Amino acid sequence: YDYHFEVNGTVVRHKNKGFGYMERFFELKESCDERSKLSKKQYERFNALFNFFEKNGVICMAKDAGTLNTSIEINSLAYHGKYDVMKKFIEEQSVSIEDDYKKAFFLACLGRWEESYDLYSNIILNSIDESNGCVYYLSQINRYRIYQSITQAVTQFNGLGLLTFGRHYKPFTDEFLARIEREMTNFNIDDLFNGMPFEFQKKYKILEFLSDNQFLYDDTVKLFELTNKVRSEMSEGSYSFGMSSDIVVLLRLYDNLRFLYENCLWSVSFHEFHQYIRNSMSLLIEKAEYERTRDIDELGFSFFGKKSGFFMEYYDFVNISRHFKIDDIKNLERS
Amino acid sequence: NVVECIKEITESSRNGKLVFFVGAGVSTLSDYPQWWRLVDKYHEELYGSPKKGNYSSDEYLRIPQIFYNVKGEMAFDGILKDFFQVDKPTNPIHDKILAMNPAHVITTNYDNLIDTACWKRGKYFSVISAEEDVANATSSRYLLKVAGDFRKGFKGENVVLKEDDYLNYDQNYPLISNLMKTIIATHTIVFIGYGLGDYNINMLLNWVRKLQKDSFHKPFFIRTDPSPIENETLIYYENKGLRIIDAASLIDSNEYDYLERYSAVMDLLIESQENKFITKDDEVIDYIYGKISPLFALQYIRKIDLKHVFE
């Protein structure tokens, strides 16, 4: 908590009184004359930082912020539904342990949960020699979530059975279901971040949130506030003529999709994450209806005449398809 | 008795105060090559063939040291690299050991079998095998490999095997003895896979005589030998500070069937922890009481927290 990093690429300094070290960092970015005063053992530690923020999106500070042009590209085959590319990627040969973490996520997305549990299992044998542990801790999480996914199936394939798919069918053998409840019944997901070295803690302190629901908590609180002030600007008949009041809900949405599909986390198949996406995009369409049927009665807007509108791109069609039910779309079509 | 030892191992496992002392007698339930098969190989490069004679101990101690002095240290290293690049599985004993939830695991073994079972669950253990790893450690759970390990080389210097290594153990490894002895006085120590005459057990029982009367807790010794213990040997070692649970005095098995005796005690510990022996209906009015008698100091308890009370 030395600098607010907002979702528009600006930086606002809060809770800091010492040397402002992000202000001096973006002075290094703009000028070249402040470079070449850098040590060669420190200058190679700059091209990695400059590529870190041009990949992630931290452009400048709050004061020297001009345009807010920010597109989006979720480069992940699981976001796009390339199924026949994934089959040819699992049939391909293993190369590293990073290419098997990206593999086991693809079998999970393909419903091959018997073989993806086994593939996460091999990564747990191998990743201690990786000296990083982030492939280890994220595989411990992802394997536990595949396990919890094969328990809600067997209490619904062996529970419901008839009305779901034909008769009482068994996608998992009786040997497998019996054995995985033996290898991981002493597991506690609440103590997975605590049972790791103090070098992995305080260097990956942002990953204790993936054990539970508190990686959605700061966005759920900001949905529930920005919902209430869009609904109350709509029950008032008020039309702001600048930036949209729910551009936070759009940018904070696509951070959560580019975090979880790129880093290959099986938390994309939750109910609580599916429910965050549809409440975020119901608000973006309920406001998009509100803004295209407006009336100024002043022969159009003089200064706001070049205002753009919300329109469905490709990424908005995919987020309604995966995350809405049909009754969620039925409401959105009658409202 | 067996029954009070059942309790004190369980309620020390629930406090973060249970440490095993794992021997070579459970690395070979997972079938790792024993040391007597090495000394038969060292006997065949120096001499012709081992005319056994039941191995009087004066040959059983010196033969690694003799081939060390004569042939060169290069040959002592590759024979270890021959016999110990084997990649063996884990027995159910290792799974039952870690399901008993240890704070530490001390071990006299130079294999890597217990660390791989510790990597496969939700807990991290700082491996100390050498002398340098005491300061550059991580997270206060320690897999303490007191005999050395081949995690940084199959050379013979890393592991103590010879007789120049037993009497120079306090000189070469000062900090691995001090950290071994600190865990013993603090924690509750259970031995796994020793045979009551050992260089790792009798060098412990001589240090324990140097302590005061009640300045330590008595270690537990899970004994798995086919012939059962006699009472006088059970007198002599209980007087020296070992509470021996004998596995042959609870089940009966053949003189070649080890895993049944090793599991009849470890199932007796875990299924005491995972409560399966509760009858007479006045044993339920003190299992529930022991989880709720702390909570009388609170006026109201959330109903989502009472599931964490009852585990």
Side-chain angles (χ1 to χ4, degrees), chain A residues 1-12 14-16 18-29 31-32 35-36 38-39 42-43 45-58 60-62 65-67 70-72 74-87 89-90 94-97 99-113 115-129 131-155 157 159-164 166 169 171-172 176-180 183-184 187-198 200-201 204 206-207 209-217 219-224 226-232 234-242 244-271 273-285 287-296 300 302 305 308-312 314-326 328-335, chain B residues 1-43 46-48 50 53-57 60-70 72 74-76 78-80 82-86 88-114 116-135 137-150 153-154 156 158-251 253-254 256 258-259 261-270 272-273 275-279 281-311:
Chain A
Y1 292 94
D2 289 331
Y3 289 97
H4 291 294
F5 288 169
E6 287 88 4
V7 291
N8 52 3
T10 62
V11 172
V12 173
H14 89 291
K15 195 183 286 185
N16 194 2
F19 184 75
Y21 62 94
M22 283 291 175
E23 288 83 356
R24 188 82 269 276
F25 183 76
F26 295 115
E27 292 178 353
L28 291 175
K29 189 178 94 277
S31 66
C32 186
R35 273 88 58 85
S36 68
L38 290 171
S39 298
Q42 304 302 115
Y43 186 82
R45 294 171 67 188
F46 188 79
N47 294 318
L49 291 174
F50 185 75
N51 289 317
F52 183 77
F53 297 118
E54 290 292 327
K55 183 259 292 181
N56 293 316
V58 183
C60 61
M61 293 295 294
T67 62
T70 299
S71 179
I72 191 66
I74 298 97
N75 291 318
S76 174
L77 296 172
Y79 186 78
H80 293 283
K82 267 80 175 176
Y83 295 112
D84 290 331
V85 181
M86 293 175 192
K87 275 97 167 64
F89 189 82
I90 299 160
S94 178
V95 174
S96 176
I97 202 166
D99 292 331
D100 288 330
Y101 177 74
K102 197 258 192 181
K103 194 78 69 69
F105 181 75
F106 286 171
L107 282 89
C109 293
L110 287 175
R112 297 174 70 185
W113 295 350
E115 295 177 352
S116 65
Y117 185 83
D118 291 331
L119 192 61
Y120 283 118
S121 299
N122 290 116
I123 301 169
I124 299 161
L125 276 300
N126 299 320
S127 60
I128 301 299
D129 291 330
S131 70
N132 208 161
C134 184
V135 184
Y136 170 73
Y137 169 62
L138 293 176
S139 297
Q140 284 288 115
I141 291 171
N142 286 316
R143 190 189 64 179
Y144 183 70
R145 297 285 185 254
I146 293 301
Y147 179 74
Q148 190 166 357
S149 299
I150 317 163
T151 299
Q152 60 91 30
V154 302
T155 59
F157 285 110
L160 294 174
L162 294 174
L163 76 159
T164 59
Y169 292 162
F172 297 94
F176 180 75
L177 298 172
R179 73 101 179 263
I180 63 170
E183 289 109 14
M184 210 171 72
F187 191 81
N188 294 117
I189 196 67
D190 292 331
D191 293 331
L192 178 59
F193 188 74
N194 296 323
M196 276 195 297
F198 196 75
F200 192 82
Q201 305 188 0
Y204 291 96
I206 66 169
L207 298 180
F209 301 101
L210 294 176
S211 178
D212 50 355
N213 289 317
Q214 61 171 354
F215 76 105
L216 288 176
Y217 175 70
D219 301 338
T220 303
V221 169
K222 192 72 177 177
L223 256 292
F224 291 166
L226 288 173
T227 296
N228 289 321
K229 72 176 291 296
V230 169
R231 303 280 174 84
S232 67
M234 287 171 68
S235 294
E236 189 175 359
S238 178
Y239 297 103
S240 297
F241 285 168
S244 65
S245 67
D246 59 353
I247 203 66
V248 176
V249 185
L250 188 144
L251 296 172
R252 190 183 284 265
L253 185 69
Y254 288 159
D255 284 332
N256 288 312
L257 292 168
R258 196 183 179 180
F259 184 75
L260 297 178
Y261 281 100
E262 298 293 328
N263 290 318
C264 294
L265 287 166
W266 184 245
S267 64
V268 301
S269 295
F270 288 174
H271 192 271
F273 183 75
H274 271 74
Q275 215 160 9
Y276 166 75
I277 304 297
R278 64 158 170 78
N279 285 124
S280 298
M281 299 206 77
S282 298
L283 182 68
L284 264 62
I285 300 164
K287 191 172 175 65
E289 188 197 8
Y290 177 75
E291 296 291 327
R292 66 108 188 276
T293 59
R294 80 178 74 182
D295 193 5
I296 192 67
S302 66
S308 296
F310 181 80
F311 67 102
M312 293 290 176
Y314 170 65
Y315 289 163
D316 299 332
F317 193 88
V318 178
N319 292 321
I320 295 171
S321 303
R322 286 186 177 172
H323 304 86
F324 294 31
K325 303 294 185 290
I326 297 158
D328 293 328
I329 301 170
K330 292 283 188 67
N331 191 22
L332 207 279
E333 287 173 352
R334 63 189 188 262
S335 297
Chain B
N1 198 1
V2 180
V3 180
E4 293 180 353
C5 297
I6 289 168
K7 292 181 181 179
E8 189 176 0
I9 296 168
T10 51
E11 67 249 6
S12 66
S13 177
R14 294 180 183 271
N15 291 317
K17 297 295 289 183
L18 182 61
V19 172
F20 287 88
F21 204 102
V22 173
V26 288
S27 183
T28 71
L29 299 183
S30 176
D31 199 2
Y32 195 72
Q34 288 183 352
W35 185 59
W36 63 269
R37 293 178 67 249
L38 286 178
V39 75
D40 293 333
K41 180 66 174 66
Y42 289 105
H43 199 277
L46 293 172
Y47 296 100
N54 290 319
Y55 276 149
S56 65
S57 298
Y60 185 71
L61 297 177
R62 272 77 174 270
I63 289 171
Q65 189 183 2
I66 298 168
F67 185 77
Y68 181 78
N69 292 321
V70 173
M74 295 296 172
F76 185 80
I79 295 171
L80 303 176
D82 186 74
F83 283 89
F84 300 110
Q85 292 178 356
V86 289
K88 298 291 179 66
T90 66
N91 57 7
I93 302 300
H94 286 89
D95 291 331
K96 288 177 185 293
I97 281 170
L98 297 175
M100 204 61 205
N101 198 2
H104 306 279
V105 172
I106 311 165
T107 180
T108 189
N109 284 319
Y110 46 83
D111 63 355
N112 202 2
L113 270 65
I114 182 62
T116 58
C118 293
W119 295 345
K120 290 187 287 184
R121 293 182 183 180
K123 56 185 181 292
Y124 184 78
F125 285 92
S126 300
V127 169
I128 309 174
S129 66
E131 177 67 20
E132 295 88 4
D133 291 332
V134 180
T138 64
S139 179
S140 180
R141 289 185 187 270
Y142 296 114
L143 176 63
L144 199 67
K145 293 182 180 180
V146 304
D149 193 72
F150 302 111
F154 288 95
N158 294 321
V159 181
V160 289
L161 299 174
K162 301 187 263 77
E163 290 293 325
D164 288 331
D165 293 335
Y166 286 164
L167 50 86
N168 295 322
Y169 182 74
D170 293 332
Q171 283 74 241
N172 285 319
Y173 287 156
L175 294 175
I176 210 67
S177 300
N178 292 320
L179 184 54
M180 187 189 78
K181 291 172 184 178
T182 302
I183 298 168
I184 294 166
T186 54
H187 295 85
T188 304
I189 302 295
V190 180
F191 290 95
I192 295 295
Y194 295 103
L196 287 177
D198 279 322
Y199 184 73
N200 293 318
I201 303 299
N202 288 319
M203 287 299 107
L204 191 146
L205 290 169
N206 293 321
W207 178 66
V208 168
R209 290 184 293 112
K210 295 180 183 292
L211 304 177
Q212 290 184 358
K213 272 77 68 178
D214 293 333
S215 180
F216 63 96
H217 296 296
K218 290 180 179 180
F220 291 102
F221 192 87
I222 292 176
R223 184 182 184 271
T224 62
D225 288 331
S227 66
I229 196 167
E230 61 271 16
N231 194 2
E232 53 270 13
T233 299
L234 191 146
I235 287 301
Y236 180 70
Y237 286 107
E238 193 270 331
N239 200 4
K240 289 172 70 176
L242 289 177
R243 283 182 285 178
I244 296 171
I245 298 168
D246 196 4
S249 296
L250 292 174
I251 62 165
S253 181
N254 297 114
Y256 285 152
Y258 279 152
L259 288 82
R261 288 190 289 271
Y262 282 103
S263 295
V265 285
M266 292 300 293
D267 290 329
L268 189 61
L269 294 173
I270 299 169
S272 179
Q273 186 178 2
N275 47 359
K276 294 177 70 68
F277 298 101
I278 297 169
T279 324
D281 294 331
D282 55 354
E283 291 179 353
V284 296
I285 313 298
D286 59 354
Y287 180 68
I288 303 172
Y289 189 88
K291 293 188 178 293
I292 291 172
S293 64
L295 307 181
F296 293 160
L298 295 176
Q299 299 290 319
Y300 183 79
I301 286 92
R302 299 186 300 172
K303 289 178 174 64
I304 59 170
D305 292 331
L306 288 171
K307 71 177 180 181
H308 297 170
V309 175
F310 288 98
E311 293 179 353

